[PDB]
PDB file of C-alpha atoms and ligand atoms in Angstrom:
ATOM      1  CA  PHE A   1      10.168  13.365-101.918  1.00 24.00           C
ATOM      2  CA  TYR A   2      11.180   9.705-102.321  1.00 24.02           C
ATOM      3  CA  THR A   3      13.428   8.551-105.160  1.00 26.43           C
ATOM      4  CA  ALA A   4      12.193   5.517-107.074  1.00 26.20           C
ATOM      5  CA  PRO A   5      14.153   2.245-107.205  1.00 28.71           C
ATOM      6  CA  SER A   6      13.346   2.215-110.939  1.00 29.93           C
ATOM      7  CA  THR A   7      15.891   5.009-111.401  1.00 30.20           C
ATOM      8  CA  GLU A   8      18.636   2.367-111.052  1.00 32.45           C
ATOM      9  CA  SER A   9      19.014   0.064-114.033  1.00 33.14           C
ATOM     10  CA  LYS A  10      20.217  -2.744-111.736  1.00 30.48           C
ATOM     11  CA  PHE A  11      16.583  -3.035-110.625  1.00 28.79           C
ATOM     12  CA  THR A  12      14.794  -2.680-113.985  1.00 28.95           C
ATOM     13  CA  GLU A  13      14.607  -6.385-114.718  1.00 28.76           C
ATOM     14  CA  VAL A  14      13.421  -7.553-111.300  1.00 30.03           C
ATOM     15  CA  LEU A  15      10.829  -4.765-111.139  1.00 29.57           C
ATOM     16  CA  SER A  16       9.572  -5.798-114.586  1.00 31.28           C
ATOM     17  CA  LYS A  17       9.243  -9.264-113.011  1.00 33.54           C
ATOM     18  CA  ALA A  18       7.482  -8.192-109.823  1.00 32.49           C
ATOM     19  CA  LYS A  19       4.552  -6.533-108.170  1.00 31.76           C
ATOM     20  CA  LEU A  20       4.723  -4.764-104.803  1.00 33.35           C
ATOM     21  CA  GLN A  21       2.375  -5.765-101.979  1.00 31.21           C
ATOM     22  CA  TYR A  22       1.801  -3.400 -99.041  1.00 26.77           C
ATOM     23  CA  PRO A  23       0.773  -3.540 -96.239  1.00 28.05           C
ATOM     24  CA  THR A  24      -0.958  -6.909 -96.674  1.00 27.69           C
ATOM     25  CA  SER A  25      -1.338  -9.263 -99.645  1.00 23.60           C
ATOM     26  CA  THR A  26      -3.036  -6.624-101.833  1.00 22.50           C
ATOM     27  CA  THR A  27      -0.937  -5.265-104.692  1.00 24.88           C
ATOM     28  CA  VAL A  28      -0.172  -1.542-104.518  1.00 23.53           C
ATOM     29  CA  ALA A  29       2.093  -1.372-107.581  1.00 22.00           C
ATOM     30  CA  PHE A  30       2.325  -3.638-110.610  1.00 24.37           C
ATOM     31  CA  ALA A  31       5.442  -3.927-112.757  1.00 21.30           C
ATOM     32  CA  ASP A  32       4.429  -1.013-114.995  1.00 18.30           C
ATOM     33  CA  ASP A  33       3.782   1.165-111.929  1.00 20.49           C
ATOM     34  CA  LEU A  34       7.157   0.208-110.441  1.00 19.24           C
ATOM     35  CA  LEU A  35       8.977   0.953-113.705  1.00 18.82           C
ATOM     36  CA  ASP A  36       7.217   4.346-113.907  1.00 17.56           C
ATOM     37  CA  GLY A  37       8.865   5.566-110.720  1.00 17.58           C
ATOM     38  CA  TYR A  38       6.711   4.215-107.892  1.00 17.46           C
ATOM     39  CA  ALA A  39       8.115   5.305-104.537  1.00 19.87           C
ATOM     40  CA  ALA A  40       6.750   5.701-101.017  1.00 20.36           C
ATOM     41  CA  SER A  41       7.940   5.648 -97.407  1.00 17.46           C
ATOM     42  CA  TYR A  42       7.629   1.838 -97.516  1.00 21.80           C
ATOM     43  CA  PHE A  43       9.546   1.401-100.822  1.00 20.96           C
ATOM     44  CA  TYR A  44      12.240   3.809-101.993  1.00 17.95           C
ATOM     45  CA  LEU A  45      15.840   4.205-103.144  1.00 18.84           C
ATOM     46  CA  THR A  46      18.356   5.438-100.576  1.00 16.97           C
ATOM     47  CA  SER A  47      21.141   7.882-101.397  1.00 14.67           C
ATOM     48  CA  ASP A  48      23.695   5.020-101.501  1.00 14.87           C
ATOM     49  CA  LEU A  49      21.487   3.066-103.924  1.00 16.47           C
ATOM     50  CA  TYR A  50      19.662   0.495-101.809  1.00 17.07           C
ATOM     51  CA  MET A  51      16.057  -0.453-102.458  1.00 18.43           C
ATOM     52  CA  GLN A  52      14.614  -0.109 -98.960  1.00 20.69           C
ATOM     53  CA  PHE A  53      11.454  -1.765 -97.657  1.00 15.87           C
ATOM     54  CA  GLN A  54       9.831  -0.577 -94.417  1.00 19.57           C
ATOM     55  CA  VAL A  55       6.583  -1.583 -92.667  1.00 21.32           C
ATOM     56  CA  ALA A  56       4.973  -1.512 -89.227  1.00 21.01           C
ATOM     57  CA  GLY A  57       2.382  -3.807 -87.708  1.00 21.01           C
ATOM     58  CA  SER A  58       1.887  -7.507 -87.032  1.00 18.22           C
ATOM     59  CA  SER A  59       2.181  -9.693 -90.145  1.00 18.17           C
ATOM     60  CA  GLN A  60       2.307  -6.616 -92.368  1.00 19.73           C
ATOM     61  CA  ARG A  61       4.626  -6.488 -95.347  1.00 17.88           C
ATOM     62  CA  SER A  62       6.308  -4.376 -97.975  1.00 17.85           C
ATOM     63  CA  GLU A  63       7.296  -7.100-100.406  1.00 19.25           C
ATOM     64  CA  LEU A  64       7.958  -7.812-104.061  1.00 20.83           C
ATOM     65  CA  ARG A  65       6.207 -10.896-105.431  1.00 22.28           C
ATOM     66  CA  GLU A  66       7.685 -12.643-108.487  1.00 20.71           C
ATOM     67  CA  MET A  67       5.874 -12.082-111.785  1.00 20.86           C
ATOM     68  CA  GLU A  68       6.375 -13.030-115.421  1.00 16.76           C
ATOM     69  CA  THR A  69       6.902 -10.269-117.974  1.00 15.19           C
ATOM     70  CA  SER A  70       3.680 -11.477-119.653  1.00 13.82           C
ATOM     71  CA  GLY A  71       1.764 -10.260-116.586  1.00 15.56           C
ATOM     72  CA  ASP A  72       1.131 -13.824-115.425  1.00 13.99           C
ATOM     73  CA  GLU A  73       1.911 -14.525-111.804  1.00 12.90           C
ATOM     74  CA  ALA A  74       4.947 -16.707-111.417  1.00 15.35           C
ATOM     75  CA  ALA A  75       3.724 -20.233-110.675  1.00 16.42           C
ATOM     76  CA  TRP A  76       6.572 -22.593-111.453  1.00 16.84           C
ATOM     77  CA  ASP A  77       6.515 -26.252-110.459  1.00 14.48           C
ATOM     78  CA  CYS A  78       7.970 -26.213-106.937  1.00 15.27           C
ATOM     79  CA  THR A  79       9.862 -29.490-107.461  1.00 19.12           C
ATOM     80  CA  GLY A  80      10.327 -29.437-111.235  1.00 16.15           C
ATOM     81  CA  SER A  81      13.409 -30.025-113.358  1.00 14.84           C
ATOM     82  CA  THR A  82      13.918 -26.352-114.240  1.00 15.48           C
ATOM     83  CA  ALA A  83      16.117 -24.578-111.705  1.00 20.20           C
ATOM     84  CA  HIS A  84      14.787 -21.430-110.064  1.00 19.51           C
ATOM     85  CA  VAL A  85      17.330 -19.094-108.502  1.00 17.60           C
ATOM     86  CA  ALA A  86      16.876 -15.933-106.475  1.00 17.17           C
ATOM     87  CA  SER A  87      19.945 -13.843-105.668  1.00 16.93           C
ATOM     88  CA  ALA A  88      20.019 -10.787-103.418  1.00 15.68           C
ATOM     89  CA  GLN A  89      22.565  -8.564-101.728  1.00 16.00           C
ATOM     90  CA  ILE A  90      20.870  -7.544 -98.484  1.00 17.90           C
ATOM     91  CA  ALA A  91      21.924  -5.206 -95.689  1.00 16.59           C
ATOM     92  CA  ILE A  92      19.851  -5.946 -92.592  1.00 17.66           C
ATOM     93  CA  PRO A  93      20.041  -2.892 -90.279  1.00 14.78           C
ATOM     94  CA  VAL A  94      19.782  -3.196 -86.543  1.00 15.53           C
ATOM     95  CA  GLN A  95      16.038  -3.478 -86.114  1.00 15.39           C
ATOM     96  CA  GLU A  96      13.954  -1.020 -84.105  1.00 16.34           C
ATOM     97  CA  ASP A  97      12.962  -1.901 -80.575  1.00 16.47           C
ATOM     98  CA  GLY A  98       9.962  -4.227 -80.653  1.00 18.03           C
ATOM     99  CA  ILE A  99      10.830  -5.863 -83.981  1.00 17.58           C
ATOM    100  CA  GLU A 100      11.502  -9.567 -83.339  1.00 17.26           C
ATOM    101  CA  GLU A 101      11.544 -11.280 -86.738  1.00 15.36           C
ATOM    102  CA  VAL A 102      11.651  -9.950 -90.310  1.00 14.05           C
ATOM    103  CA  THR A 103      11.261 -12.223 -93.326  1.00 16.52           C
ATOM    104  CA  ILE A 104      13.466 -10.974 -96.172  1.00 18.02           C
ATOM    105  CA  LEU A 105      13.178 -13.683 -98.875  1.00 17.92           C
ATOM    106  CA  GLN A 106      10.600 -16.404 -99.495  1.00 18.82           C
ATOM    107  CA  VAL A 107       9.707 -19.285-101.708  1.00 18.29           C
ATOM    108  CA  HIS A 108       5.917 -19.399-101.379  1.00 19.37           C
ATOM    109  CA  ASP A 109       3.370 -21.801-102.856  1.00 19.65           C
ATOM    110  CA  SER A 110       0.450 -20.521-104.887  1.00 18.98           C
ATOM    111  CA  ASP A 111      -1.939 -20.917-101.949  1.00 12.91           C
ATOM    112  CA  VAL A 112      -1.272 -20.263 -98.257  1.00  9.91           C
ATOM    113  CA  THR A 113       2.044 -21.980 -97.400  1.00 10.03           C
ATOM    114  CA  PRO A 114       5.613 -20.596 -97.364  1.00 11.63           C
ATOM    115  CA  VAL A 115       8.009 -23.275 -98.584  1.00 10.55           C
ATOM    116  CA  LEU A 116      10.993 -21.286 -97.336  1.00 14.15           C
ATOM    117  CA  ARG A 117      11.351 -18.108 -95.329  1.00 16.35           C
ATOM    118  CA  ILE A 118      14.738 -16.529 -94.754  1.00 15.02           C
ATOM    119  CA  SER A 119      14.333 -14.205 -91.803  1.00 16.13           C
ATOM    120  CA  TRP A 120      16.247 -12.198 -89.239  1.00 15.57           C
ATOM    121  CA  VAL A 121      15.298 -13.224 -85.684  1.00 13.68           C
ATOM    122  CA  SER A 122      16.085 -11.683 -82.316  1.00 14.26           C
ATOM    123  CA  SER A 123      16.204 -15.176 -80.795  1.00 14.74           C
ATOM    124  CA  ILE A 124      15.519 -18.759 -81.826  1.00 19.14           C
ATOM    125  CA  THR A 125      15.816 -22.108 -80.043  1.00 17.80           C
ATOM    126  CA  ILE A 126      16.520 -25.170 -82.221  1.00 16.98           C
ATOM    127  CA  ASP A 127      17.045 -28.654 -80.749  1.00 17.25           C
ATOM    128  CA  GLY A 128      17.739 -27.087 -77.351  1.00 13.85           C
ATOM    129  CA  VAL A 129      20.259 -24.516 -78.655  1.00 12.70           C
ATOM    130  CA  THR A 130      19.389 -20.825 -78.393  1.00 10.93           C
ATOM    131  CA  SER A 131      20.898 -18.407 -80.923  1.00 16.76           C
ATOM    132  CA  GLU A 132      20.539 -14.618 -80.667  1.00 17.66           C
ATOM    133  CA  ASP A 133      20.540 -12.094 -83.512  1.00 17.59           C
ATOM    134  CA  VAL A 134      20.805 -14.502 -86.450  1.00 19.18           C
ATOM    135  CA  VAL A 135      19.502 -15.078 -89.963  1.00 19.46           C
ATOM    136  CA  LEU A 136      17.408 -18.245 -90.198  1.00 20.34           C
ATOM    137  CA  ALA A 137      15.927 -20.571 -92.816  1.00 19.49           C
ATOM    138  CA  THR A 138      12.474 -22.000 -92.074  1.00 19.13           C
ATOM    139  CA  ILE A 139      11.118 -24.798 -94.305  1.00 20.04           C
ATOM    140  CA  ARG A 140       7.558 -25.925 -93.684  1.00 23.17           C
ATOM    141  CA  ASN A 141       7.183 -29.673 -93.290  1.00 22.56           C
ATOM    142  CA  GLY A 142       3.982 -29.758 -95.319  1.00 19.69           C
ATOM    143  CA  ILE A 143       0.830 -27.927 -96.281  1.00 20.04           C
ATOM    144  CA  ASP A 144      -1.103 -29.793 -93.569  1.00 22.15           C
ATOM    145  CA  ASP A 145       1.689 -29.640 -90.962  1.00 22.96           C
ATOM    146  CA  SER A 146       2.177 -26.250 -89.285  1.00 21.71           C
ATOM    147  CA  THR A 147       5.664 -27.203 -88.073  1.00 18.17           C
ATOM    148  CA  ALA A 148       8.900 -26.408 -89.867  1.00 15.94           C
ATOM    149  CA  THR A 149      12.566 -27.331 -89.938  1.00 20.30           C
ATOM    150  CA  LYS A 150      14.749 -24.372 -88.954  1.00 21.31           C
ATOM    151  CA  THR A 151      18.448 -23.812 -89.716  1.00 23.22           C
ATOM    152  CA  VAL A 152      20.639 -20.911 -88.600  1.00 23.96           C
ATOM    153  CA  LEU A 153      22.347 -19.498 -91.702  1.00 21.97           C
ATOM    154  CA  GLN A 154      24.445 -16.558 -90.456  1.00 21.92           C
ATOM    155  CA  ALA A 155      25.199 -14.381 -87.471  1.00 19.67           C
ATOM    156  CA  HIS A 156      23.493 -11.050 -88.169  1.00 21.84           C
ATOM    157  CA  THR A 157      25.762  -8.351 -89.540  1.00 20.74           C
ATOM    158  CA  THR A 158      24.740  -4.974 -90.856  1.00 22.52           C
ATOM    159  CA  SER A 159      27.161  -5.541 -93.765  1.00 18.62           C
ATOM    160  CA  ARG A 160      25.824  -6.208 -97.241  1.00 18.92           C
ATOM    161  CA  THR A 161      25.441  -9.981 -97.546  1.00 18.77           C
ATOM    162  CA  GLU A 162      24.860 -12.138-100.633  1.00 17.24           C
ATOM    163  CA  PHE A 163      21.969 -14.638-100.346  1.00 18.49           C
ATOM    164  CA  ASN A 164      21.241 -17.198-103.063  1.00 16.58           C
ATOM    165  CA  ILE A 165      18.314 -19.637-103.128  1.00 18.22           C
ATOM    166  CA  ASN A 166      18.544 -22.491-105.645  1.00 17.76           C
ATOM    167  CA  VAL A 167      15.458 -24.676-106.143  1.00 18.80           C
ATOM    168  CA  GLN A 168      15.642 -27.646-108.496  1.00 17.67           C
ATOM    169  CA  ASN A 169      14.048 -31.033-108.530  1.00 18.31           C
ATOM    170  CA  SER A 170      12.769 -31.651-105.005  1.00 14.73           C
ATOM    171  CA  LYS A 171      15.756 -29.944-103.350  1.00 16.13           C
ATOM    172  CA  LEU A 172      16.483 -26.426-102.095  1.00 15.86           C
ATOM    173  CA  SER A 173      19.900 -24.933-101.283  1.00 17.51           C
ATOM    174  CA  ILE A 174      20.935 -21.607 -99.719  1.00 17.85           C
ATOM    175  CA  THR A 175      24.326 -19.950-100.001  1.00 15.66           C
ATOM    176  CA  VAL A 176      25.384 -16.989 -97.864  1.00 14.59           C
ATOM    177  CA  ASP A 177      28.425 -15.013 -99.020  1.00 20.20           C
ATOM    178  CA  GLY A 178      29.341 -17.939-101.251  1.00 18.79           C
ATOM    179  CA  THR A 179      29.175 -20.657 -98.569  1.00 18.69           C
ATOM    180  CA  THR A 180      26.482 -23.321 -98.670  1.00 19.17           C
ATOM    181  CA  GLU A 181      24.531 -23.016 -95.419  1.00 15.28           C
ATOM    182  CA  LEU A 182      21.615 -25.284 -96.381  1.00 17.01           C
ATOM    183  CA  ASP A 183      22.622 -28.111 -98.763  1.00 15.63           C
ATOM    184  CA  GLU A 184      19.806 -29.666-100.812  1.00 16.19           C
ATOM    185  CA  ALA A 185      17.075 -29.664 -98.190  1.00 17.78           C
ATOM    186  CA  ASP A 186      14.150 -31.808 -99.242  1.00 19.06           C
ATOM    187  CA  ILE A 187      10.979 -30.005-100.389  1.00 24.39           C
ATOM    188  CA  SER A 188       9.141 -32.987-101.895  1.00 27.80           C
ATOM    189  CA  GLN A 189       6.219 -32.124 -99.588  1.00 27.26           C
ATOM    190  CA  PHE A 190       5.536 -29.449-102.265  1.00 26.14           C
ATOM    191  CA  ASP A 191       5.259 -31.899-105.185  1.00 24.45           C
ATOM    192  CA  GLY A 192       2.201 -30.825-107.144  1.00 21.38           C
ATOM    193  CA  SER A 193       2.354 -27.279-105.765  1.00 24.15           C
ATOM    194  CA  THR A 194       3.399 -24.236-107.748  1.00 26.27           C
ATOM    195  CA  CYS A 195       5.765 -21.626-106.365  1.00 23.67           C
ATOM    196  CA  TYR A 196       7.180 -18.119-106.629  1.00 21.25           C
ATOM    197  CA  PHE A 197       9.834 -15.975-104.954  1.00 21.27           C
ATOM    198  CA  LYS A 198       9.263 -12.955-102.723  1.00 20.41           C
ATOM    199  CA  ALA A 199      11.664 -10.370-101.314  1.00 20.77           C
ATOM    200  CA  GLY A 200      11.291  -7.420 -98.971  1.00 20.37           C
ATOM    201  CA  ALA A 201      10.285  -6.915 -95.359  1.00 26.28           C
ATOM    202  CA  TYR A 202       7.561  -9.071 -93.778  1.00 26.48           C
ATOM    203  CA  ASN A 203       7.153  -8.262 -90.080  1.00 22.30           C
ATOM    204  CA  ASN A 204       6.537 -11.373 -87.984  1.00 23.14           C
ATOM    205  CA  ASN A 205       5.246 -11.282 -84.399  1.00 25.22           C
ATOM    206  CA  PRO A 206       6.497  -7.839 -83.298  1.00 25.70           C
ATOM    207  CA  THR A 207       6.137  -6.888 -79.658  1.00 26.47           C
ATOM    208  CA  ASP A 208       5.582  -3.222 -80.608  1.00 23.45           C
ATOM    209  CA  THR A 209       2.975  -3.067 -83.362  1.00 23.80           C
ATOM    210  CA  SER A 210       3.949   0.552 -84.170  1.00 22.17           C
ATOM    211  CA  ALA A 211       7.656  -0.113 -84.731  1.00 22.42           C
ATOM    212  CA  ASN A 212       9.010  -0.227 -88.303  1.00 23.82           C
ATOM    213  CA  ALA A 213      10.819  -3.248 -89.720  1.00 23.61           C
ATOM    214  CA  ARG A 214      13.348  -2.131 -92.328  1.00 25.93           C
ATOM    215  CA  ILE A 215      15.378  -4.109 -94.912  1.00 21.12           C
ATOM    216  CA  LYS A 216      17.687  -2.864 -97.702  1.00 20.05           C
ATOM    217  CA  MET A 217      18.616  -4.602-100.953  1.00 19.08           C
ATOM    218  CA  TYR A 218      21.563  -3.549-103.082  1.00 20.57           C
ATOM    219  CA  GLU A 219      20.898  -6.155-105.795  1.00 21.92           C
ATOM    220  CA  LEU A 220      17.946  -8.463-106.436  1.00 20.71           C
ATOM    221  CA  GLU A 221      17.113 -10.856-109.241  1.00 20.21           C
ATOM    222  CA  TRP A 222      15.181 -14.023-109.901  1.00 19.83           C
ATOM    223  CA  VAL A 223      15.767 -16.224-112.901  1.00 17.66           C
ATOM    224  CA  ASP A 224      15.072 -19.576-114.517  1.00 17.53           C
ATOM    225  CA  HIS A 225      17.730 -21.879-115.929  1.00 18.35           C
ATOM    226  CA  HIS A 226      16.541 -24.586-118.303  1.00 18.52           C
TER     227      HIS A 226
HETATM  228  C1  LIG B 301       5.570 -20.270 -88.708  1.00 18.99           C
HETATM  229  O1  LIG B 301       5.853 -19.138 -89.553  1.00 18.99           O
HETATM  230  C2  LIG B 301       4.694 -18.460 -90.060  1.00 18.99           C
HETATM  231  C3  LIG B 301       4.942 -16.970 -90.095  1.00 18.99           C
HETATM  232  O2  LIG B 301       5.010 -16.451 -88.743  1.00 18.99           O
HETATM  233  C4  LIG B 301       3.883 -16.220 -90.826  1.00 18.99           C
HETATM  234  O3  LIG B 301       2.640 -16.341 -90.103  1.00 18.99           O
HETATM  235  C5  LIG B 301       3.674 -16.766 -92.225  1.00 18.99           C
HETATM  236  O4  LIG B 301       2.654 -16.099 -92.823  1.00 18.99           O
HETATM  237  O5  LIG B 301       3.360 -18.231 -92.172  1.00 18.99           O
HETATM  238  C6  LIG B 301       4.425 -18.970 -91.478  1.00 18.99           C
HETATM  239  C7  LIG B 301       4.001 -20.399 -91.405  1.00 18.99           C
HETATM  240  O6  LIG B 301       2.777 -20.676 -91.227  1.00 18.99           O
HETATM  241  O7  LIG B 301       4.872 -21.305 -91.519  1.00 18.99           O
HETATM  242  O8  LIG B 301       5.116 -19.807 -87.378  1.00 18.99           O
HETATM  243  C8  LIG B 301       4.814 -20.943 -86.494  1.00 18.99           C
HETATM  244  C9  LIG B 301       4.360 -20.386 -85.189  1.00 18.99           C
HETATM  245  O9  LIG B 301       4.884 -19.330 -84.756  1.00 18.99           O
HETATM  246  O10 LIG B 301       3.450 -20.970 -84.538  1.00 18.99           O
HETATM  247  C10 LIG B 301       6.026 -21.855 -86.311  1.00 18.99           C
HETATM  248  O11 LIG B 301       5.612 -23.012 -85.563  1.00 18.99           O
HETATM  249  C11 LIG B 301       6.225 -22.989 -84.275  1.00 18.99           C
HETATM  250  O12 LIG B 301       7.700 -23.148 -84.431  1.00 18.99           O
HETATM  251  C12 LIG B 301       8.389 -23.232 -83.144  1.00 18.99           C
HETATM  252  C13 LIG B 301       9.825 -23.472 -83.490  1.00 18.99           C
HETATM  253  O13 LIG B 301      10.135 -24.444 -84.235  1.00 18.99           O
HETATM  254  O14 LIG B 301      10.711 -22.685 -83.068  1.00 18.99           O
HETATM  255  C14 LIG B 301       7.801 -24.353 -82.279  1.00 18.99           C
HETATM  256  O15 LIG B 301       8.408 -24.304 -80.990  1.00 18.99           O
HETATM  257  C15 LIG B 301       6.310 -24.216 -82.130  1.00 18.99           C
HETATM  258  O16 LIG B 301       5.774 -25.373 -81.428  1.00 18.99           O
HETATM  259  C16 LIG B 301       5.630 -24.114 -83.445  1.00 18.99           C
HETATM  260  O17 LIG B 301       5.799 -25.346 -84.180  1.00 18.99           O
HETATM  261  C17 LIG B 301       6.530 -22.287 -87.657  1.00 18.99           C
HETATM  262  O18 LIG B 301       7.757 -23.032 -87.510  1.00 18.99           O
HETATM  263  C18 LIG B 301       6.813 -21.134 -88.567  1.00 18.99           C
HETATM  264  O19 LIG B 301       7.915 -20.342 -88.066  1.00 18.99           O
END
């Protein structure tokens, strides 16, 4: 009894340029499946026209992964001259008890490393400063370095919020409701990698493995500019 996100034309293009992974990295719906009305408890259209992602369990996900309309996986040069831009209007609900971090947007390399995660966190401590209930950017310092540089982007609100990721040359910027919150962070550690965007709900380190992470997107797109 779930309504498909494909019923809203504002999602046709991104769905044509995506596949849906749930609950792990395996694809459950390709672009053609999505466009043909795919819907489930973990991926459906709400009555006020949000595409909602929901998932339980540690490191489990309900996530769109950027594709080309040709059926090729997106695999653009992470630090190339062509700009890559993802734009989303996201409402992050108050998360269920036991949910501690939910990744909502990513730039990921074509192997095993997230270049950027934008996530909601219950708490984070950065350079001795603890912030509660915030949206965070995490940029990995390298493929062979498990550490990352973290930047608080926004105090969590349930209100619909515009996120924009702009990747061009070896730099990455993030705007939140029109304000630059990460200005040309260096991602040269991904020279020679290829990359793609992701969007959805990726449940990181929950304390209750049965609780559902839940994220809603009112608009979503990813584009190239040459
Ligand atoms: C890291 O995020 C990982 C996600 O949790 C998912 O597993 C994803 O699939 O891959 C991400 C990744 O590998 O980058 O998780 C580690 C971690 O939890 O161990 C983070 O490293 C720690 O970061 C904290 C901190 O900076 O707050 C440090 O105190 C700690 O010593 C580790 O360096 C890593 O930054 C990142 O979030």
